[PDB]
Structure formats: structure tokens, C-alpha cells
Amino acid sequence: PSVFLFPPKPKDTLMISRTPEVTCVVVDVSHEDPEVKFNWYVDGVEVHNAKTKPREEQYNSTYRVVSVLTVLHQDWLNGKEYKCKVSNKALPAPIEKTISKAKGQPREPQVYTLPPSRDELTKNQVSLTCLVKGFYPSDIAVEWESNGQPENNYKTTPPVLDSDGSFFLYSKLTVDKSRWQQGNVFSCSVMHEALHNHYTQKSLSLS
Amino acid sequence: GGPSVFLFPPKPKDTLMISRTPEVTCVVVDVSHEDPEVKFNWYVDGVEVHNAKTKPREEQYNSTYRVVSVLTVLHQDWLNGKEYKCKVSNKALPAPIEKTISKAKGQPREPQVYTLPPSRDELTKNQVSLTCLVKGFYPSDIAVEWESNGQPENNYKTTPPVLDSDGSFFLYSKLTVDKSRWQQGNVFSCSVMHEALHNHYTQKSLSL
Ligand SMILES: *[C@@H]1O[C@H](CO[C@@H]2O[C@@H](C)[C@@H](O)[C@@H](O)[C@@H]2O)[C@@H](O[C@@H]2O[C@H](CO)[C@@H](O[C@@H]3O[C@H](CO[C@H]4O[C@H](CO)[C@@H](O)[C@H](O)[C@@H]4O[C@@H]4O[C@H](CO)[C@@H](O)[C@H](O)[C@H]4NC(C)=O)[C@@H](O)[C@H](O[C@H]4O[C@H](CO)[C@@H](O)[C@H](O)[C@@H]4O[C@@H]4O[C@H](CO)[C@@H](O)[C@H](O)[C@H]4NC(C)=O)[C@@H]3O)[C@H](O)[C@H]2NC(C)=O)[C@H](O)[C@H]1NC(C)=O
Ligand SMILES: *[C@H]1O[C@H](CO[C@@H]2O[C@@H](C)[C@@H](O)[C@@H](O)[C@@H]2O)[C@@H](O[C@@H]2O[C@H](CO)[C@@H](O[C@@H]3O[C@H](CO[C@H]4O[C@H](CO)[C@@H](O)[C@H](O)[C@@H]4O[C@@H]4O[C@H](CO)[C@@H](O)[C@H](O)[C@H]4NC(C)=O)[C@@H](O)[C@H](O[C@H]4O[C@H](CO)[C@@H](O)[C@H](O)[C@@H]4O[C@@H]4O[C@H](CO)[C@@H](O)[C@H](O)[C@H]4NC(C)=O)[C@@H]3O)[C@H](O)[C@H]2NC(C)=O)[C@H](O)[C@H]1NC(C)=O
């Protein structure tokens, strides 16, 4: 069997109303010796407020078991390490893995929206672009909207490391050209720790 | 935990330009001293082939052997979706390991290439962002380069291909230039290479 430790989702750590969670995911657990334990430490100290989830069988004979610790927003955002221990009869010894947020001074994203290229405007569907650059660390969340209604048809590139050590990404929202034509306003929402109130938005309209 | 095998495909650019030499590479690692002998077999669509070039093994600093075999592939063969199988045998193995690689299956689709000038809010800053949007391509193997006046740029970074809901791929490439150049009115050029482009090339320019 193996181990894989994972961080909160960015959106989760940035809005106080949401519940950010770290999660140990153990793979290639077998029927024989099926009992898997966990233990959790935050900055090494044992913490007890965690919750192992009930298990699941995989096709390939082997299980996929998963524990979950809830986390404080400021704790994660201040670099505390989240260590997860895992035990099992088919071990050499107790596995262990660790995670924490990237080190470094947070850097604020600059957010630009770009209209469709002339060349694409004539087509049935046009592409609205949102360029987010200069941000550190790479934990970020992007969303689109019009009229305070969530647009659903957009995709966002992963963050890419730029030449100066910050990250950028693009988000592409595709809309039927008419909406673009009618003059509707579209907005790109960006969530990031270095932003005032973890959040900014930029609008895109036909001029 | 015996030998492990990794099979790497050609670089996209190499399969698209007849001048270059696309290769598939079968890398074996963690080969022991106990059994250091390694045998490669190569198959192109199930049919065994014999022109592969296998380098002599190399001890790594962790006292395991690394062995590499290189199969030169024909461009039209890779682009016609032939499958390349590497087969690795070692006396430490319960059975031989086999890995297979090919161009991703599906129908190719031509990229649409679009260049976007700097946002107004950014035309101010000392340095400015030229964007090349490449959309609607399949499969995701692609190459993007920026040029001005025949010379390559360098200050550019490109996203990985992203899956776009209609099944095709898109990506953005970002060229960064000093504000002066952009206002001085130099044409900057975004080259794309892809199997589904005529001549496997297109190029769009960007200026003020
Ligand atoms: C003893 O030492 C050797 C040598 O190691 C080297 O030196 C030591 C001292 C250390 O410093 C090492 O860090 C250093 O690498 C060890 O050999 C290594 O063995 C590991 C596995 O244990 C290999 O990992 C794999 O790497 C490939 C990527 O490999 C390219 O990139 C590396 C740099 O990032 C580079 O070093 C490699 O040489 C290689 O470079 C490429 O070479 C080709 C051929 O020449 C060339 O054309 C390319 O241009 C070039 N690319 C460059 C420069 O970037 C990685 O892809 C593998 O990931 C797959 O498999 C994993 C399983 O191990 C899995 O977790 C991953 O998710 C991934 O899974 C696969 O993913 C594909 C698609 O993503 C998917 O289709 C499959 O489903 C899936 N396959 C599965 C599940 O198997 C993997 O991480 C190292 O490459 C290798 N190093 C070298 C130089 O060969 C050895 O392990 C040591 N042993 C010990 C500790 O005892
Ligand atoms: C039999 O099947 C099982 C189950 O597989 C599944 O079912 C079968 C039947 C098939 O259909 C499969 O295709 C199918 O997926 C296999 O179990 C898989 O086992 C592998 C290990 O062999 C595990 O590998 C790893 O995956 C993680 C990422 O997994 C997160 O992302 C996955 C997609 O990428 C996703 O599937 C997971 O669910 C999980 O996702 C997330 O879930 C969390 C928690 O719920 C959630 O909060 C997240 O939001 C969500 N994320 C997303 C995107 O949805 C990957 O991280 C592991 O990677 C590293 O490890 C490699 C070595 O294992 C190494 O080569 C890589 O380079 C990389 O190494 C790390 O690199 C970083 C940076 O460079 C470095 O900092 C780290 O130190 C380094 N790590 C270290 C220390 O090694 C790894 O690839 C799969 O998770 C697991 N799949 C599932 C679904 O459980 C099993 O292997 C099969 N068995 C056999 C014999 O074949």
C-alpha cells in the first residue's frame, strides 16, 4: 500500500464561511491486513479534532481508504505543517507524510480582462479572456459572472511559473456572440490571499 | 521492487518537421548488479522491429543500472497513430515489462490562433503582456514560439494544453515586452505548429 497527502482548496482557505480540509489518501490496501490507522499532528503536536472516513473497494482488488482533518483558515495561511501518520499490518514501519502552504511573501495578482480578437468575434461563440499575473503562492481560484449570476462555461489554465518567480494563468469564458453583441457585462472574479478581502473582480464589456 | 520502465514519446516539433528526427525512448532504471543483463524488444503495431539503438548501461550513484533504448520513428507513422511497444526483460523479473505509446486517439482538429493586445490597464506598466490564444486543437501535441523581426523572443511562457468541454484543447502563450517596444509599433509574431495545420504551421502577428 501507498500514501498521498493533500492541501485545502484555495477557495476554502480564503473565505471564512467555508471549511478547509487536508486529507490523507491511502492506496493499494488489500483485503488481508485491511485495518488502516491514522494519526494527525499540526506543527508536530497531536491534535484530536480529525475524522477518518468510512472506506471503499477498488476494482483492482485493493482498497482506497481516506482520513480528513479540518483546518483553521489562519493556521493554514501562516504555514503550519500538517503531518499525517499511517500504520498497517503489511508495513515495514509506520509511513508518514507532510504538507504546508508554500513559503514566501505573498504577492498580489494583477487582473486584466481581454475582449475577443477581431478574428473570432464574427463566429457563433466568442472567447472572453482573464489574465491573472504576478501572484504568489500559486493557490488561487477564478470564477465568472454576469448580472451576479454564475457563468458556467469557462475553463482556467493551471498556474504557470513566470520568469520572476510569481505565477500567472488565463481564464477563458466562452459566450454566444449575441450576448457579447447585446452589450452585457461579464466579470472575472479572483480569490487570493494577497488580495484585499481575499477577492477582487474585473469587468469586461463591449465598447 | 525490481526494474521500472518509462516510455517517452517524441517531442511534438520533431514529428511535424521532416528535417527533424522523432524518437521514442525506453528507459529502464533500478537494474541490479545481481542481474544486470537487460534485453529490449520493439514492436510497431504488434510487429517486431530491429533498428532500435540501445546504449550501454550506466551505473548511477545509487548503485543501480540505468539502461536506455532509442527507437527512431517515421513522422507519417507517428501521425498515423501507430503504436510503439517497448518490451523489457531482466532475470530479476517475474515476467517481462511492456509499455506502449502512441499519438492520443481521436480525430485531429485544427487550432484557431488569436492574438490579443495588452489590456488598457496594463499598457501603462513598464512591461506589457502579449497574448496568443490557441484554441480548438486535437490532439494536444503542439508547439508555440514568439518572434519579432525574424528573431526569437525569450520572455514568454506558455500554459499546458487544457481540455475545453467540447473535447478539444486550448492554451495561452504570454509574451512579455518592454512598454517602449509595444508603443514603438514593432510587430510581434506567435508561431504555432500542429499536425492539423496546413504545412503544420501558422503564424499570427500582433502590433499597435
Ligand atoms: C537511482 O538513481 C536514478 C537516477 O536518478 C537521478 O539521480 C538521482 C541521484 C536523483 O537525483 C534523481 O532525482 C535523478 O532522477 C533513479 O532513476 C529515476 O527513477 C525515477 C523513478 O524512481 C524516474 O522517475 C520517472 O520520471 C519520469 C520523468 O523522467 C524525465 O524527467 C526527469 C526530470 O524531471 C529526468 O531526470 C528523466 O531522465 C526524464 O527525462 C527525459 O528523458 C527523455 C529520454 O531521454 C527525454 O526525451 C526527455 O526530454 C526528458 N525529459 C526531461 C528532461 O524532463 C516521470 O514521467 C515518471 O512519472 C511517471 O511514473 C511515476 C512512477 O514512478 C508516477 O508516479 C508518475 O505519476 C508518472 O506516471 C506515468 O505518467 C504517464 C503520463 O504522465 C502515464 O501515461 C502513466 O500512466 C504513468 N506511468 C506509471 C504509473 O508508471 C517518473 O517520475 C526518473 O526519471 C529516473 N531518473 C533518471 C535520470 O532516469 C532511480 O530511481 C534511483 N533509485 C533509487 C533511489 O534507488
Ligand atoms: C489500482 O487502482 C487504484 C485506484 O485507481 C484508480 O482505479 C483504477 C482501477 C484505475 O481505474 C485508475 O485509473 C484509477 O485512478 C490505483 O490507486 C491510484 O494509486 C496511485 C499510486 O499508484 C495514486 O497516485 C497518486 O495520485 C496522487 C493524486 O491523487 C489526488 O489526485 C488524483 C489525480 O491526480 C486523484 O485521483 C486523487 O483522488 C487525489 O485527488 C484528490 O483528492 C483529494 C482528497 O480527496 C482532494 O482533496 C483533491 O482535490 C483531489 N484532486 C483532484 C485533482 O481531483 C498524486 O499526488 C501522487 O503523486 C506523486 O507521486 C508519484 C509516486 O506515487 C510521483 O511519481 C509523482 O511525481 C508525484 O510525486 C510527488 O511530486 C510532488 C511535486 O513534484 C512532490 O512534492 C512530492 O513529494 C511527490 N510525492 C512523493 C513523496 O512521492 C500519485 O500519482 C492515486 O491517487 C490512486 N488513485 C486513486 C483514485 O485513489 C492503484 O495504483 C492501482 N494499482 C495497481 C497495482 O495498478
The domain locations on chain B are 3-102, 103-208
User: Is B1 touching A (CB cutoff 8 A)?
Assistant: no
Query: Which chain A residue shows the shortest CA-CA distance from B175?
Result: A162
3-state helix, strand, coil in chain B (%, to 5): 10, 50, 40
Measure Cα distances from B160 to A127, A153, A197, B105 in Å: 18, 19, 30, 19
What is the grid cell recorded at A172?
477563458
A179: enclosing H helix or E strand: helix A177-182
CATH 3.40.50.300 fits A101-207, yes or no: no
**Contact assessment for residue A160 and residue A167, using Cβ atoms and an 8 Å cutoff:** yes
Find residues 99-128 of chain B whose CB sits inside 8 Å of chain A.
112, 114-119, 121-122
User: CATH assignment of B103-208?
Assistant: 2.60.40.10
Regarding the beta carbon of A58 and ligand 2, being less than 6 Å apart is answered yes
Assign domain B3-102 to its CATH architecture.
Answer: Sandwich (2.60)
Are A61 and A30 contacting, i.e. CB atoms less than 8 angstroms apart? yes
Question: Ligand 1 in contact with B6 (CB < 6 A)?
Answer: yes
Nearest to A129 among B116, B162, B163 (CB): B116
Nearest-CA residue for atom 15 of ligand 2: A58
Strand partners, A130: A113, A171
Measured distance CA(A128)–CA(A175) in Å, rounded:
8
* C-alpha neighbours within 13 Å on the C-beta side of residue B19: 3
State the burial class of residue A185 (Cβ atoms within 10 Å of its Cβ: 0-12, 13-18, 19+).
exposed
| CATH class of the structural domain A1-100 | mainly beta
Q: What is the grid cell recorded at B50? A: 530491429
Ligand 2 centre distance from Cα of residue A70 (Å): 21
Assigned C-alpha cell, A196: 484585499
Contact between chains at B131 and A129 (C-beta distance less than 8 A)? yes
Q: Is the peptide bond before A10 cis (omega within 30 degrees of 0)?
A: no
Q: Is the peptide bond before A7 cis (omega within 30 degrees of 0)?
A: no
Distance (angstroms) between ligand 1 centre and the Cα of B104 equals: 21
Resolution, angstroms, 1 dp:
2.3
Alpha helices in chain B (DSSP H): 12-16, 75-79, 120-123, 179-184
Instruction: Please list every residue in chain A followed by a chain break, i.e. its C lies more than 2.5 Å from the next written N.
Output: none
| Residue recorded with cell 534485453 | B39
Residues of chain A contacting residue B165, judged by C-beta atoms under 8 Å apart: 153, 155
What's the rounded Cα separation, in Å, for the pair A188 and A184?
13
CA nearest B36: which of B87, B86, B90, B89?
Answer: B90
Nearest Cα neighbor of A161 from A76, A102, A81, A77 is A102
B192 vs A123, B111, B132, B140, B162, CA distance in Å?
A: 21, 9, 10, 12, 16
Evaluated on CA atoms B162, B164, B170, B173, the torsion sign reads negative
Ligand 2: nearest atom to the Cα of A23 = 44
How many whole angstroms from B29 Cα to the centroid of ligand 1? 9
By Cβ distance, the residue of A110, A114, A158 closest to B116 is: A114
Q: What kind of experiment solved this structure? A: X-ray
Residues 6+ apart with CB under 8 A from A121: A177, A180
Give the minimum alpha-carbon distance from B139 to chain A in angstroms, rounded to a whole number.
17
